[model samples]
Target chain A: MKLEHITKKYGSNVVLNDIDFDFGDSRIVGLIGKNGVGKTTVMKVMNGNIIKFDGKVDIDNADNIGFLIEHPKLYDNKSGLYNLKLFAQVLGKGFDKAYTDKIIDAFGMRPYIKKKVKKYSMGMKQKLAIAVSLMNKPKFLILDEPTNGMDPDGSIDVLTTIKSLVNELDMRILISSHKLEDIELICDRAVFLRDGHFVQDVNMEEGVASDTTIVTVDHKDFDRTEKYLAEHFQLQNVDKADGHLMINAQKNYQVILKALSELDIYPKYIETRKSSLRDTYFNINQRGDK
Target chain B: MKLEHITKKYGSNVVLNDIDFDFGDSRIVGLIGKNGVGKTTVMKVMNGNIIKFDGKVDIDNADNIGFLIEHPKLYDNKSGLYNLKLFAQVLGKGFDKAYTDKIIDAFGMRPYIKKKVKKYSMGMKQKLAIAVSLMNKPKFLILDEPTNGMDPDGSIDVLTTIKSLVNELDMRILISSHKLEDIELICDRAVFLRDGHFVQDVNMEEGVASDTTIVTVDHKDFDRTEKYLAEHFQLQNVDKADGHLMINAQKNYQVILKALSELDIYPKYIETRKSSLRDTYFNINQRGDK
Candidate 1:
């Protein structure tokens, strides 16, 4: 699914504005933001649930899209097998035994497959809900807060199952969770939202060095430092936040030291933050408050 | 306060058993566990709220205890300042100016301090609750998921406020948070719990490198590998969980490699997870689960 020039509003309040995004096939994208930041709205729009919106959402494989938004839509009195059978019957094609079995096996639901839905624990219900989404053999899966309220063990089990399926089925997954750790483990790309706008999208990459550097000047004065950076370096979103400056340092430390030392200026601390996915998410979302 | 031989039970179900632990003054201790793991129950006992228990809960420096459990107890219609005032009056100080202002200033709530509690965001409410906890000038603080619904920035603001107070007034903080990042940044020691039992409590010290190793067995048959670890090495909870078994490596990797090599057993992968606090929590909790 690809969203282009998407704009959504609830009367005067712009829920999403000119948002552009693409959920990649064979990859998992973590849609992240604070509550009501349009993460859910954007997902709802992609799944064709939110029809009245501006711009375009091109779902390439429309029939093969599966979504579990916010909560599970299931019969409380039914068993996991019963729910799966009902979803399969609704989707037709006899449910494809091999395909359905693969998801069931991956989630390790054989033990609880016969248990009543109401008797299922929070973790078991999540697995069952996710299993139901895959009943149609979707090329893409959209999940919002899949592992919320789950214990670590249950959450890890579900995440591992999804991670394995991402590889086995060659599926693209777009998921949002309040559990940030789950995102760090399951996703490779992050879509950060701010006030119903697509703020930044970054792919998960290696090494403890973020492409950016956080530089804290000894003194508050930054006019000279800003001028030096603009004149000498190709900076990336260099601005004042958190009582410091954020810069993209593609060069050596000597260059920064040389630039500052010559001007009788020095950074109190210099650290790279892009080393970890969770760190990058915070770095981006922290800037969103602006 | 120090707890010795503490045990709590409802009928025959033991919620806590022989739990002996101490909260160090002027230091932040992280009480970590999954849901229904007695994390909140322990904190409640410490703050003298849960009195129907066995053994001693020494409420040293009595009447100097402050707690924020589950949600902040504040009037929804009142402003942040008003709640603090009401709490202050109830605490018998009639709102100490010099002290209360310090709490407000430290929390960086000057911008939205006057806003009604009902109009406050999750971040605003979190700050207000934490500020109210400081009303009594307690030598110790007990917080249960203080940053529960807060975004990273708001969480950090609350954490930083507590951190500053720890240094300024020689205050001790006993805080429980599902946010592992906050625990790593704010607390110096970890008190892990599982099934109401006190697990290992490790301080942030080097040499015993919990972060340096997550020994994932390479051999296909983990049963034999598990036997080898138990028979030869002093394994740290070498049980199976997740896709692979989790282990904390310390002292030497040569011991594990040599043992595997002798049995013609090769590890599939061995990696270091020294980057964050969640790994350590998992490492310890995995043991507790056993």
Candidate 2:
């Protein structure tokens, strides 16, 4: 799927402005942005649900599209299995019992397959929607806040299944979520939008070599070690909550360890932390810059 | 806040069975479980929204409760600020401009504060709800999936504000979300509910000392190192994903490092990862076991 010079406007306000991006095949891409940044509008344009936009969207391999929007509308009185069968029929394909069964197993929806949709819990409903979408075997899958109400186990199951689909069937998936850690784990590439403009595009496969590391020390020695480390290395940030000191330094572990050892400060826990997608998003947007 | 012998039933199906737990002051507690496992029901009970349950909930201080359910109701025609003022009026003190202004600024809602609720985006609506609930400075707070429609920056803002509230005002917070990493990062304790029963209660402070470490090696020898460590250390639960190996062992990092070093393997990254609340929840409630 490719978008070229996409633009959309509502009256005097522009929603999307000259957007150009290419979503590669068989890759999981995370679509992210701040509030009112046009991520949903982009999704609608990609799915042919919105046509007012001025752009060229070449959806060559996206003919077989499967989507699970933020709030899926389901027949409340129908059973879970009945809903899946109806969805299968809507796809213009005969029901494949084997594929349906596999999705049920993967999503852990067997216990409620016979239950009415209204009686299912929030997590169960989300899992059922995911199962129905997967059963179609679409070439392009679009999920907007897919794991909104899922439990931790259910989320892991969904993620593992998405990874497997990319590896085995070579399916392209696009997901938008509020969970930054989930995006960091499952996405091969991520793009951030701000105020109708594409601001940052990041590739997860690339690595940046920096000497910065975050170290945690005990509560008693937090102040002493913080001052000591700042004198020797460049301290970026420090916090004393959670009964530990989280320090950002531009030096290797060996050098910091030696400095702490000289100060008689033995950290209970020391580790290197990476900059999260959330951090990157905030840094690029500069929301609080006065 | 404390609960004793909490029990609830709906048409012969038990929702919560003889559960007892306590939440300390100025700490964040996470409630997690599978679908239909009573996580939401428990939240309702805590907020005094459900009266059919037979339980003893002792709130040291009443009339200081703030709650945000899964689907919050708001006036679509009113502006965001007007909606917040209405909610504030319902709290029985009219509207305090100082508090409202502070919360609005903290949440970065200045851009859309004057817009109609119908025109606001999903993330903007969520931020408005959160700002309204937090304006009153409640002693006990309950949020069910607070980050459902937010972006990564929004998530960071919410989490950072919550941490500050816990530190400055000494607030007790209870959150239920599908994001396990968020739960681990914010909550001081976690309770797992399964089939309407308290299956596992974990103190995050104590759980970190037991058995979990993230080990990273050279990209070239990751597979060989994983196999060697799994075979030599009898590691049963090892997650080999994202160019790292997560091992579950009881303070065995020293021994594992020694073994790896002797095998002529020098790891580029070796750090003990924190134990996740989701891992404890899944370990206690295995799938397909019942």
Alpha-carbon RMSD of each model: 11.1, 9.4
Each model's lDDT comes to 0.69, 0.70
lDDT of 2 by residue, A1-290 (tens): 68889998989988888988777543888887766567778888877789886868777653678888777667888888888888888873668767766666766666668989998877778777776776677888888877877765566667987798678777788887666766666678887777787777776665333323655666667777777767865565566665444455332355554444445555555556565576777677776432
Query: Which TM-score values does chain B get in all models?
Result: 0.81, 0.76
lDDT of 1 by residue, B1-290 (tens): 78888888878777887778776533878777775566667778777877788577786555577688865678998778878888878764565678877887878788888888878765468668778888877887888777755566767766876777877787788887777777776777777787676666667754443544434543466678777666765555333442233355444444454455567554433444445556546665665445
Query: Which consecutive 10 residues in model 1 chain A have the weakest lDDT in total?
Result: A249-258
Docking class of 2: acceptable
TM-score of 1: 0.67
The DockQ score of candidate 1 comes to: 0.09
lDDT of 2 at B173: 84
Badly placed stretches (over 4 Å) of model 1 are A8-17, A34-41, A44-52, A58-143, A161-173, A194-275, A282-290, B24-26, B205-211, B218-264, B272-280, B287-290
Residues A85-160, candidate 1: write the lDDT tens digits.
Answer: 9987786356677877776776777877998999776556766788888887777788876765455655776788
